[PDB]
Amino acid sequence: DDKAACADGIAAVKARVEKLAPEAVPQKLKRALKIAEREQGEGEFDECLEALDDAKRALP
Amino acid sequence: DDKAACADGIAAVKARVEKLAPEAVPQKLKRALKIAEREQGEGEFDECLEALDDAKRALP
Ligand SMILES: [Eu+2]
């Protein structure tokens, strides 16, 4: 469901980000991940998924 | 728009709540107002309006 997909999506995006050099991680990508995590913690798992879509678009 | 309606709705609901005795204000009403304010601060003015609908249903 959206809760599982949000948790798995945060893990998947972070796994890709952890392949980049830390000094190569765009601020917009960090911000989008933080928004997804905030929404996950609020129980807005649907909103988390939409923020994860933004994070993927920020991947270099 | 949703931003103005959220701000006005927070003010309207609070105005009604401030007519109750403070020891008569249900916890669920306080919680719903706090959620609406959190969502307003996040810029989720649409979500704020949906939380305000819950707050109105919590009015005694
Ligand atoms: Eu939210």
mmCIF file of all heavy atoms in Angstrom, chain A residues 3-56:
data_model
loop_
_atom_site.group_PDB
_atom_site.id
_atom_site.type_symbol
_atom_site.label_atom_id
_atom_site.label_comp_id
_atom_site.label_asym_id
_atom_site.label_seq_id
_atom_site.Cartn_x
_atom_site.Cartn_y
_atom_site.Cartn_z
ATOM 1 N N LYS A 3 1.804 3.173 2.393
ATOM 2 C CA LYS A 3 2.760 3.175 3.493
ATOM 3 C C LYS A 3 3.992 2.345 3.154
ATOM 4 O O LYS A 3 5.130 2.799 3.337
ATOM 5 C CB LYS A 3 2.078 2.661 4.762
ATOM 6 C CG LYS A 3 2.942 2.635 5.997
ATOM 7 C CD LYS A 3 2.066 2.443 7.223
ATOM 8 C CE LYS A 3 2.898 2.400 8.483
ATOM 9 N NZ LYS A 3 3.789 1.202 8.534
ATOM 10 N N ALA A 4 3.787 1.122 2.653
ATOM 11 C CA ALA A 4 4.915 0.281 2.271
ATOM 12 C C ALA A 4 5.675 0.888 1.108
ATOM 13 O O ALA A 4 6.915 0.896 1.102
ATOM 14 C CB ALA A 4 4.435 -1.124 1.905
ATOM 15 N N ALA A 5 4.945 1.418 0.123
ATOM 16 C CA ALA A 5 5.588 1.990 -1.048
ATOM 17 C C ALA A 5 6.384 3.238 -0.688
ATOM 18 O O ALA A 5 7.431 3.494 -1.289
ATOM 19 C CB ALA A 5 4.534 2.304 -2.110
ATOM 20 N N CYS A 6 5.909 4.025 0.284
ATOM 21 C CA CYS A 6 6.667 5.189 0.741
ATOM 22 C C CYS A 6 7.950 4.772 1.446
ATOM 23 O O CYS A 6 9.021 5.333 1.182
ATOM 24 C CB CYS A 6 5.800 6.068 1.648
ATOM 25 S SG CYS A 6 6.641 7.257 2.694
ATOM 26 N N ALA A 7 7.853 3.796 2.355
ATOM 27 C CA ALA A 7 9.039 3.307 3.049
ATOM 28 C C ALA A 7 10.039 2.717 2.064
ATOM 29 O O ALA A 7 11.238 3.023 2.115
ATOM 30 C CB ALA A 7 8.641 2.253 4.080
ATOM 31 N N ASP A 8 9.565 1.848 1.165
ATOM 32 C CA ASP A 8 10.452 1.249 0.172
ATOM 33 C C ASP A 8 11.028 2.305 -0.768
ATOM 34 O O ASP A 8 12.189 2.212 -1.187
ATOM 35 C CB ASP A 8 9.697 0.183 -0.632
ATOM 36 C CG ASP A 8 9.397 -1.087 0.177
ATOM 37 O OD1 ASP A 8 10.073 -1.345 1.199
ATOM 38 O OD2 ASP A 8 8.480 -1.846 -0.218
ATOM 39 N N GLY A 9 10.232 3.319 -1.109
ATOM 40 C CA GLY A 9 10.719 4.351 -2.009
ATOM 41 C C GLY A 9 11.780 5.234 -1.380
ATOM 42 O O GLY A 9 12.742 5.635 -2.046
ATOM 43 N N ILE A 10 11.610 5.570 -0.101
ATOM 44 C CA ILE A 10 12.654 6.294 0.614
ATOM 45 C C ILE A 10 13.942 5.488 0.616
ATOM 46 O O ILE A 10 15.024 6.015 0.329
ATOM 47 C CB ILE A 10 12.197 6.682 2.034
ATOM 48 C CG1 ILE A 10 11.093 7.738 1.964
ATOM 49 C CG2 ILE A 10 13.376 7.199 2.862
ATOM 50 C CD1 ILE A 10 10.369 7.966 3.271
ATOM 51 N N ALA A 11 13.838 4.192 0.905
ATOM 52 C CA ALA A 11 15.022 3.341 0.907
ATOM 53 C C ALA A 11 15.657 3.265 -0.477
ATOM 54 O O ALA A 11 16.884 3.345 -0.610
ATOM 55 C CB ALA A 11 14.654 1.949 1.408
ATOM 56 N N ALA A 12 14.840 3.104 -1.518
ATOM 57 C CA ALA A 12 15.367 3.003 -2.877
ATOM 58 C C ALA A 12 16.069 4.289 -3.303
ATOM 59 O O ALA A 12 17.182 4.250 -3.837
ATOM 60 C CB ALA A 12 14.248 2.649 -3.856
ATOM 61 N N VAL A 13 15.428 5.442 -3.090
ATOM 62 C CA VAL A 13 16.048 6.706 -3.481
ATOM 63 C C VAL A 13 17.333 6.945 -2.694
ATOM 64 O O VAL A 13 18.360 7.343 -3.261
ATOM 65 C CB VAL A 13 15.050 7.875 -3.360
ATOM 66 C CG1 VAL A 13 15.769 9.207 -3.487
ATOM 67 C CG2 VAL A 13 13.968 7.754 -4.426
ATOM 68 N N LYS A 14 17.306 6.693 -1.382
ATOM 69 C CA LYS A 14 18.512 6.871 -0.578
ATOM 70 C C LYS A 14 19.626 5.945 -1.036
ATOM 71 O O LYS A 14 20.802 6.329 -1.037
ATOM 72 C CB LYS A 14 18.210 6.637 0.898
ATOM 73 C CG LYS A 14 17.445 7.764 1.536
ATOM 74 C CD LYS A 14 17.190 7.494 3.000
ATOM 75 C CE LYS A 14 18.481 7.417 3.781
ATOM 76 N NZ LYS A 14 18.222 8.003 5.124
ATOM 77 N N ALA A 15 19.276 4.719 -1.424
ATOM 78 C CA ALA A 15 20.285 3.787 -1.909
ATOM 79 C C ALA A 15 20.978 4.329 -3.152
ATOM 80 O O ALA A 15 22.201 4.203 -3.295
ATOM 81 C CB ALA A 15 19.653 2.421 -2.181
ATOM 82 N N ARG A 16 20.215 4.942 -4.062
ATOM 83 C CA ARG A 16 20.824 5.562 -5.234
ATOM 84 C C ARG A 16 21.658 6.780 -4.847
ATOM 85 O O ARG A 16 22.766 6.968 -5.368
ATOM 86 C CB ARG A 16 19.748 5.928 -6.259
ATOM 87 C CG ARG A 16 20.240 6.827 -7.389
ATOM 88 C CD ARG A 16 21.294 6.140 -8.262
ATOM 89 N NE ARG A 16 22.173 7.096 -8.931
ATOM 90 C CZ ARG A 16 21.847 7.787 -10.018
ATOM 91 N NH1 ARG A 16 20.663 7.648 -10.596
ATOM 92 N NH2 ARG A 16 22.727 8.642 -10.531
ATOM 93 N N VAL A 17 21.149 7.611 -3.930
ATOM 94 C CA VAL A 17 21.882 8.809 -3.514
ATOM 95 C C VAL A 17 23.202 8.438 -2.849
ATOM 96 O O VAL A 17 24.220 9.120 -3.031
ATOM 97 C CB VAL A 17 21.011 9.702 -2.607
ATOM 98 C CG1 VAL A 17 21.805 10.917 -2.137
ATOM 99 C CG2 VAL A 17 19.748 10.140 -3.334
ATOM 100 N N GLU A 18 23.212 7.354 -2.073
ATOM 101 C CA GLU A 18 24.435 6.931 -1.399
ATOM 102 C C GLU A 18 25.497 6.404 -2.357
ATOM 103 O O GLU A 18 26.612 6.112 -1.913
ATOM 104 C CB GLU A 18 24.112 5.914 -0.308
ATOM 105 C CG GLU A 18 23.396 6.539 0.873
ATOM 106 C CD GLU A 18 22.628 5.530 1.691
ATOM 107 O OE1 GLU A 18 22.716 4.325 1.380
ATOM 108 O OE2 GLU A 18 21.929 5.945 2.642
ATOM 109 N N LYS A 19 25.182 6.282 -3.647
ATOM 110 C CA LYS A 19 26.182 5.975 -4.659
ATOM 111 C C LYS A 19 26.899 7.214 -5.175
ATOM 112 O O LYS A 19 27.955 7.085 -5.803
ATOM 113 C CB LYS A 19 25.535 5.242 -5.839
ATOM 114 C CG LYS A 19 25.636 3.723 -5.778
ATOM 115 C CD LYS A 19 24.935 3.158 -4.559
ATOM 116 C CE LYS A 19 24.840 1.641 -4.625
ATOM 117 N NZ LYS A 19 24.005 1.101 -3.515
ATOM 118 N N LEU A 20 26.358 8.401 -4.930
ATOM 119 C CA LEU A 20 26.990 9.641 -5.353
ATOM 120 C C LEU A 20 28.028 10.087 -4.331
ATOM 121 O O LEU A 20 27.970 9.726 -3.153
ATOM 122 C CB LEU A 20 25.943 10.743 -5.500
ATOM 123 C CG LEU A 20 24.796 10.575 -6.493
ATOM 124 C CD1 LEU A 20 23.754 11.660 -6.270
ATOM 125 C CD2 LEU A 20 25.327 10.628 -7.912
ATOM 126 N N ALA A 21 28.993 10.880 -4.797
ATOM 127 C CA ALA A 21 29.887 11.548 -3.866
ATOM 128 C C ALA A 21 29.061 12.501 -3.007
ATOM 129 O O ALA A 21 28.189 13.204 -3.540
ATOM 130 C CB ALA A 21 30.954 12.337 -4.619
ATOM 131 N N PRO A 22 29.277 12.535 -1.684
ATOM 132 C CA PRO A 22 28.473 13.432 -0.835
ATOM 133 C C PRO A 22 28.505 14.877 -1.285
ATOM 134 O O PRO A 22 27.478 15.560 -1.201
ATOM 135 C CB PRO A 22 29.068 13.237 0.567
ATOM 136 C CG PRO A 22 30.410 12.633 0.346
ATOM 137 C CD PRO A 22 30.293 11.805 -0.906
ATOM 138 N N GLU A 23 29.643 15.356 -1.784
ATOM 139 C CA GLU A 23 29.732 16.706 -2.331
ATOM 140 C C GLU A 23 29.124 16.831 -3.728
ATOM 141 O O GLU A 23 29.238 17.893 -4.353
ATOM 142 C CB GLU A 23 31.193 17.184 -2.327
ATOM 143 C CG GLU A 23 32.111 16.443 -3.296
ATOM 144 C CD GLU A 23 32.684 15.152 -2.730
ATOM 145 O OE1 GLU A 23 32.108 14.595 -1.772
ATOM 146 O OE2 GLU A 23 33.722 14.691 -3.248
ATOM 147 N N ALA A 24 28.492 15.782 -4.236
ATOM 148 C CA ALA A 24 27.786 15.850 -5.500
ATOM 149 C C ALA A 24 26.278 15.723 -5.333
ATOM 150 O O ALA A 24 25.559 15.656 -6.337
ATOM 151 C CB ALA A 24 28.293 14.769 -6.459
ATOM 152 N N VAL A 25 25.767 15.677 -4.106
ATOM 153 C CA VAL A 25 24.344 15.455 -3.865
ATOM 154 C C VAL A 25 23.641 16.811 -3.905
ATOM 155 O O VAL A 25 23.910 17.658 -3.033
ATOM 156 C CB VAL A 25 24.082 14.734 -2.537
ATOM 157 C CG1 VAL A 25 22.574 14.574 -2.331
ATOM 158 C CG2 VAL A 25 24.782 13.381 -2.525
ATOM 159 N N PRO A 26 22.750 17.057 -4.873
ATOM 160 C CA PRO A 26 22.121 18.375 -4.969
ATOM 161 C C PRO A 26 21.264 18.663 -3.747
ATOM 162 O O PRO A 26 20.628 17.775 -3.162
ATOM 163 C CB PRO A 26 21.240 18.259 -6.223
ATOM 164 C CG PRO A 26 21.840 17.130 -6.999
ATOM 165 C CD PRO A 26 22.301 16.167 -5.956
ATOM 166 N N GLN A 27 21.248 19.939 -3.377
ATOM 167 C CA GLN A 27 20.396 20.400 -2.286
ATOM 168 C C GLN A 27 18.928 20.067 -2.549
ATOM 169 O O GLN A 27 18.182 19.683 -1.630
ATOM 170 C CB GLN A 27 20.564 21.912 -2.144
ATOM 171 C CG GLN A 27 19.778 22.507 -1.008
ATOM 172 C CD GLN A 27 20.533 22.462 0.312
ATOM 173 O OE1 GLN A 27 21.074 21.426 0.691
ATOM 174 N NE2 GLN A 27 20.557 23.579 1.018
ATOM 175 N N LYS A 28 18.482 20.215 -3.804
ATOM 176 C CA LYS A 28 17.081 19.942 -4.098
ATOM 177 C C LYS A 28 16.738 18.481 -3.848
ATOM 178 O O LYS A 28 15.607 18.170 -3.451
ATOM 179 C CB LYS A 28 16.730 20.369 -5.524
ATOM 180 C CG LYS A 28 17.452 19.616 -6.600
ATOM 181 C CD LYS A 28 16.966 20.030 -7.980
ATOM 182 C CE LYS A 28 17.239 21.507 -8.270
ATOM 183 N NZ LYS A 28 17.059 21.818 -9.708
ATOM 184 N N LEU A 29 17.696 17.581 -4.046
ATOM 185 C CA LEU A 29 17.463 16.165 -3.793
ATOM 186 C C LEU A 29 17.359 15.900 -2.300
ATOM 187 O O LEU A 29 16.463 15.168 -1.847
ATOM 188 C CB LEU A 29 18.611 15.374 -4.424
ATOM 189 C CG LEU A 29 18.731 13.874 -4.233
ATOM 190 C CD1 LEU A 29 17.447 13.210 -4.651
ATOM 191 C CD2 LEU A 29 19.885 13.373 -5.089
ATOM 192 N N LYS A 30 18.261 16.503 -1.518
ATOM 193 C CA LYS A 30 18.169 16.370 -0.070
ATOM 194 C C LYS A 30 16.854 16.915 0.447
ATOM 195 O O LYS A 30 16.208 16.287 1.298
ATOM 196 C CB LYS A 30 19.308 17.112 0.593
ATOM 197 C CG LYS A 30 20.600 16.613 0.126
ATOM 198 C CD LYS A 30 21.723 17.379 0.713
ATOM 199 C CE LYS A 30 22.906 16.619 0.359
ATOM 200 N NZ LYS A 30 22.982 15.364 1.142
ATOM 201 N N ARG A 31 16.433 18.080 -0.058
ATOM 202 C CA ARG A 31 15.176 18.675 0.380
ATOM 203 C C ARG A 31 13.990 17.779 0.059
ATOM 204 O O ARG A 31 13.091 17.603 0.893
ATOM 205 C CB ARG A 31 15.009 20.028 -0.288
ATOM 206 C CG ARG A 31 15.952 21.057 0.275
ATOM 207 C CD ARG A 31 15.899 22.349 -0.491
ATOM 208 N NE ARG A 31 16.702 23.370 0.161
ATOM 209 C CZ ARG A 31 16.881 24.584 -0.323
ATOM 210 N NH1 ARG A 31 16.463 24.912 -1.539
ATOM 211 N NH2 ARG A 31 17.532 25.482 0.410
ATOM 212 N N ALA A 32 13.965 17.200 -1.139
ATOM 213 C CA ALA A 32 12.834 16.357 -1.507
ATOM 214 C C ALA A 32 12.780 15.113 -0.630
ATOM 215 O O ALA A 32 11.702 14.693 -0.216
ATOM 216 C CB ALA A 32 12.903 15.978 -2.987
ATOM 217 N N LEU A 33 13.931 14.512 -0.322
ATOM 218 C CA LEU A 33 13.939 13.360 0.569
ATOM 219 C C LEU A 33 13.434 13.741 1.948
ATOM 220 O O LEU A 33 12.685 12.984 2.571
ATOM 221 C CB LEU A 33 15.356 12.799 0.672
ATOM 222 C CG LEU A 33 15.710 11.613 -0.205
ATOM 223 C CD1 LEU A 33 17.174 11.280 0.035
ATOM 224 C CD2 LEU A 33 14.807 10.433 0.117
ATOM 225 N N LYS A 34 13.847 14.908 2.448
ATOM 226 C CA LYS A 34 13.417 15.340 3.775
ATOM 227 C C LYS A 34 11.918 15.585 3.801
ATOM 228 O O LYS A 34 11.252 15.246 4.783
ATOM 229 C CB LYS A 34 14.206 16.574 4.224
ATOM 230 C CG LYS A 34 15.623 16.197 4.645
ATOM 231 C CD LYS A 34 16.618 17.314 4.534
ATOM 232 C CE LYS A 34 16.537 18.270 5.705
ATOM 233 N NZ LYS A 34 17.459 19.448 5.637
ATOM 234 N N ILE A 35 11.364 16.148 2.726
ATOM 235 C CA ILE A 35 9.912 16.323 2.659
ATOM 236 C C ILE A 35 9.206 14.973 2.651
ATOM 237 O O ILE A 35 8.210 14.771 3.360
ATOM 238 C CB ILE A 35 9.508 17.193 1.457
ATOM 239 C CG1 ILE A 35 10.080 18.603 1.613
ATOM 240 C CG2 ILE A 35 7.988 17.272 1.368
ATOM 241 C CD1 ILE A 35 9.348 19.418 2.671
ATOM 242 N N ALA A 36 9.705 14.021 1.862
ATOM 243 C CA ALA A 36 9.084 12.703 1.849
ATOM 244 C C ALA A 36 9.123 12.084 3.242
ATOM 245 O O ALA A 36 8.130 11.524 3.709
ATOM 246 C CB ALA A 36 9.786 11.810 0.831
ATOM 247 N N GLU A 37 10.249 12.226 3.947
ATOM 248 C CA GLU A 37 10.351 11.674 5.298
ATOM 249 C C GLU A 37 9.419 12.381 6.272
ATOM 250 O O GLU A 37 8.819 11.732 7.139
ATOM 251 C CB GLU A 37 11.797 11.730 5.782
ATOM 252 C CG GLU A 37 12.682 10.824 4.973
ATOM 253 C CD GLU A 37 14.158 11.087 5.137
ATOM 254 O OE1 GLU A 37 14.551 12.113 5.714
ATOM 255 O OE2 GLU A 37 14.941 10.249 4.618
ATOM 256 N N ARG A 38 9.290 13.704 6.148
ATOM 257 C CA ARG A 38 8.350 14.427 6.997
ATOM 258 C C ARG A 38 6.931 13.926 6.771
ATOM 259 O O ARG A 38 6.196 13.643 7.723
ATOM 260 C CB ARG A 38 8.389 15.911 6.689
ATOM 261 C CG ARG A 38 7.409 16.702 7.551
ATOM 262 C CD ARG A 38 7.301 18.140 7.087
ATOM 263 N NE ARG A 38 6.577 18.203 5.825
ATOM 264 C CZ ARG A 38 6.574 19.250 5.013
ATOM 265 N NH1 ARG A 38 7.280 20.338 5.287
ATOM 266 N NH2 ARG A 38 5.855 19.197 3.895
ATOM 267 N N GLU A 39 6.526 13.811 5.508
ATOM 268 C CA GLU A 39 5.175 13.360 5.202
ATOM 269 C C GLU A 39 4.970 11.923 5.656
ATOM 270 O O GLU A 39 3.904 11.589 6.176
ATOM 271 C CB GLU A 39 4.876 13.562 3.713
ATOM 272 C CG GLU A 39 4.876 15.043 3.342
ATOM 273 C CD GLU A 39 3.872 15.851 4.167
ATOM 274 O OE1 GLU A 39 2.719 15.379 4.330
ATOM 275 O OE2 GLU A 39 4.209 16.940 4.683
ATOM 276 N N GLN A 40 5.996 11.064 5.511
ATOM 277 C CA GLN A 40 5.899 9.702 6.034
ATOM 278 C C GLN A 40 5.622 9.715 7.532
ATOM 279 O O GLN A 40 4.743 8.996 8.019
ATOM 280 C CB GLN A 40 7.209 8.975 5.756
ATOM 281 C CG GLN A 40 7.245 7.549 6.289
ATOM 282 C CD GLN A 40 8.647 6.941 6.233
ATOM 283 O OE1 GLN A 40 9.636 7.587 6.610
ATOM 284 N NE2 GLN A 40 8.744 5.717 5.723
ATOM 285 N N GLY A 41 6.365 10.536 8.278
ATOM 286 C CA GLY A 41 6.169 10.620 9.711
ATOM 287 C C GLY A 41 4.810 11.158 10.094
ATOM 288 O O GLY A 41 4.276 10.812 11.158
ATOM 289 N N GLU A 42 4.229 12.010 9.245
ATOM 290 C CA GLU A 42 2.880 12.522 9.461
ATOM 291 C C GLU A 42 1.814 11.506 9.087
ATOM 292 O O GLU A 42 0.621 11.739 9.342
ATOM 293 C CB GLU A 42 2.680 13.839 8.700
ATOM 294 C CG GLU A 42 3.599 14.932 9.195
ATOM 295 C CD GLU A 42 3.517 16.215 8.420
ATOM 296 O OE1 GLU A 42 2.788 16.258 7.402
ATOM 297 O OE2 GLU A 42 4.192 17.175 8.842
ATOM 298 N N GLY A 43 2.211 10.371 8.519
ATOM 299 C CA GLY A 43 1.230 9.436 8.016
ATOM 300 C C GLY A 43 0.631 9.802 6.681
ATOM 301 O O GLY A 43 -0.356 9.181 6.276
ATOM 302 N N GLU A 44 1.197 10.792 5.983
ATOM 303 C CA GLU A 44 0.742 11.166 4.650
ATOM 304 C C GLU A 44 1.584 10.418 3.617
ATOM 305 O O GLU A 44 2.422 10.985 2.908
ATOM 306 C CB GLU A 44 0.824 12.675 4.485
ATOM 307 C CG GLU A 44 0.130 13.416 5.605
ATOM 308 C CD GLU A 44 -0.376 14.730 5.143
ATOM 309 O OE1 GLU A 44 -1.173 14.692 4.200
ATOM 310 O OE2 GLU A 44 0.044 15.790 5.675
ATOM 311 N N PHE A 45 1.354 9.098 3.561
ATOM 312 C CA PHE A 45 2.228 8.245 2.766
ATOM 313 C C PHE A 45 2.041 8.512 1.288
ATOM 314 O O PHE A 45 2.984 8.354 0.503
ATOM 315 C CB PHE A 45 1.924 6.790 3.083
ATOM 316 C CG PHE A 45 2.031 6.478 4.534
ATOM 317 C CD1 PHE A 45 0.899 6.182 5.282
ATOM 318 C CD2 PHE A 45 3.263 6.507 5.150
ATOM 319 C CE1 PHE A 45 1.013 5.916 6.632
ATOM 320 C CE2 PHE A 45 3.390 6.234 6.499
ATOM 321 C CZ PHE A 45 2.261 5.934 7.240
ATOM 322 N N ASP A 46 0.841 8.940 0.907
ATOM 323 C CA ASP A 46 0.583 9.342 -0.469
ATOM 324 C C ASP A 46 1.422 10.560 -0.844
ATOM 325 O O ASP A 46 2.053 10.589 -1.910
ATOM 326 C CB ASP A 46 -0.926 9.569 -0.673
ATOM 327 C CG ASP A 46 -1.603 10.347 0.478
ATOM 328 O OD1 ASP A 46 -0.915 10.961 1.331
ATOM 329 O OD2 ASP A 46 -2.861 10.348 0.507
ATOM 330 N N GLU A 47 1.469 11.555 0.044
ATOM 331 C CA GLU A 47 2.282 12.758 -0.158
ATOM 332 C C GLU A 47 3.767 12.418 -0.188
ATOM 333 O O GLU A 47 4.557 13.052 -0.899
ATOM 334 C CB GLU A 47 2.033 13.699 1.019
ATOM 335 C CG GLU A 47 0.602 14.159 1.149
ATOM 336 C CD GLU A 47 0.258 15.097 0.044
ATOM 337 O OE1 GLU A 47 -0.123 14.634 -1.048
ATOM 338 O OE2 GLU A 47 0.433 16.310 0.254
ATOM 339 N N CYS A 48 4.162 11.448 0.621
ATOM 340 C CA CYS A 48 5.536 10.974 0.592
ATOM 341 C C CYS A 48 5.899 10.474 -0.802
ATOM 342 O O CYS A 48 6.977 10.789 -1.318
ATOM 343 C CB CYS A 48 5.662 9.857 1.623
ATOM 344 S SG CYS A 48 7.064 8.800 1.401
ATOM 345 N N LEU A 49 4.988 9.730 -1.441
ATOM 346 C CA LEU A 49 5.277 9.171 -2.760
ATOM 347 C C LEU A 49 5.420 10.273 -3.802
ATOM 348 O O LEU A 49 6.288 10.199 -4.681
ATOM 349 C CB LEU A 49 4.180 8.181 -3.156
ATOM 350 C CG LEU A 49 4.221 6.829 -2.428
ATOM 351 C CD1 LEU A 49 2.912 6.063 -2.557
ATOM 352 C CD2 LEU A 49 5.379 5.996 -2.934
ATOM 353 N N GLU A 50 4.606 11.323 -3.694
ATOM 354 C CA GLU A 50 4.712 12.430 -4.638
ATOM 355 C C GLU A 50 6.013 13.200 -4.450
ATOM 356 O O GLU A 50 6.639 13.618 -5.429
ATOM 357 C CB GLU A 50 3.479 13.320 -4.505
ATOM 358 C CG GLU A 50 2.200 12.521 -4.746
ATOM 359 C CD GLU A 50 1.006 13.365 -5.155
ATOM 360 O OE1 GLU A 50 1.193 14.526 -5.610
ATOM 361 O OE2 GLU A 50 -0.134 12.860 -5.035
ATOM 362 N N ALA A 51 6.467 13.352 -3.198
ATOM 363 C CA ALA A 51 7.768 13.967 -2.956
ATOM 364 C C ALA A 51 8.902 13.092 -3.463
ATOM 365 O O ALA A 51 9.928 13.612 -3.920
ATOM 366 C CB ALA A 51 7.956 14.253 -1.466
ATOM 367 N N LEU A 52 8.749 11.771 -3.379
ATOM 368 C CA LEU A 52 9.767 10.875 -3.921
ATOM 369 C C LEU A 52 9.873 11.004 -5.439
ATOM 370 O O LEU A 52 10.967 10.879 -6.003
ATOM 371 C CB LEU A 52 9.467 9.432 -3.514
ATOM 372 C CG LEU A 52 9.736 9.138 -2.046
ATOM 373 C CD1 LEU A 52 9.228 7.744 -1.669
ATOM 374 C CD2 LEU A 52 11.242 9.282 -1.759
ATOM 375 N N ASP A 53 8.740 11.206 -6.122
ATOM 376 C CA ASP A 53 8.790 11.508 -7.550
ATOM 377 C C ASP A 53 9.637 12.750 -7.823
ATOM 378 O O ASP A 53 10.432 12.774 -8.766
ATOM 379 C CB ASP A 53 7.376 11.672 -8.113
ATOM 380 C CG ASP A 53 6.662 10.340 -8.328
ATOM 381 O OD1 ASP A 53 7.324 9.279 -8.400
ATOM 382 O OD2 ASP A 53 5.419 10.359 -8.453
ATOM 383 N N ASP A 54 9.495 13.785 -6.996
ATOM 384 C CA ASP A 54 10.337 14.968 -7.164
ATOM 385 C C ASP A 54 11.803 14.651 -6.899
ATOM 386 O O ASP A 54 12.688 15.144 -7.611
ATOM 387 C CB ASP A 54 9.862 16.094 -6.248
ATOM 388 C CG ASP A 54 8.572 16.735 -6.730
ATOM 389 O OD1 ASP A 54 8.198 16.505 -7.898
ATOM 390 O OD2 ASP A 54 7.936 17.463 -5.936
ATOM 391 N N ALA A 55 12.085 13.834 -5.882
ATOM 392 C CA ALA A 55 13.468 13.467 -5.597
ATOM 393 C C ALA A 55 14.113 12.746 -6.775
ATOM 394 O O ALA A 55 15.268 13.018 -7.117
ATOM 395 C CB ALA A 55 13.545 12.614 -4.329
ATOM 396 N N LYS A 56 13.388 11.816 -7.402
ATOM 397 C CA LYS A 56 13.942 11.113 -8.556
ATOM 398 C C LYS A 56 14.269 12.077 -9.686
ATOM 399 O O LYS A 56 15.282 11.916 -10.379
ATOM 400 C CB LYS A 56 12.968 10.038 -9.029
ATOM 401 C CG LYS A 56 12.782 8.907 -8.050
ATOM 402 C CD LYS A 56 11.510 8.170 -8.398
ATOM 403 C CE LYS A 56 11.495 6.764 -7.848
ATOM 404 N NZ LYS A 56 10.665 5.898 -8.723
#
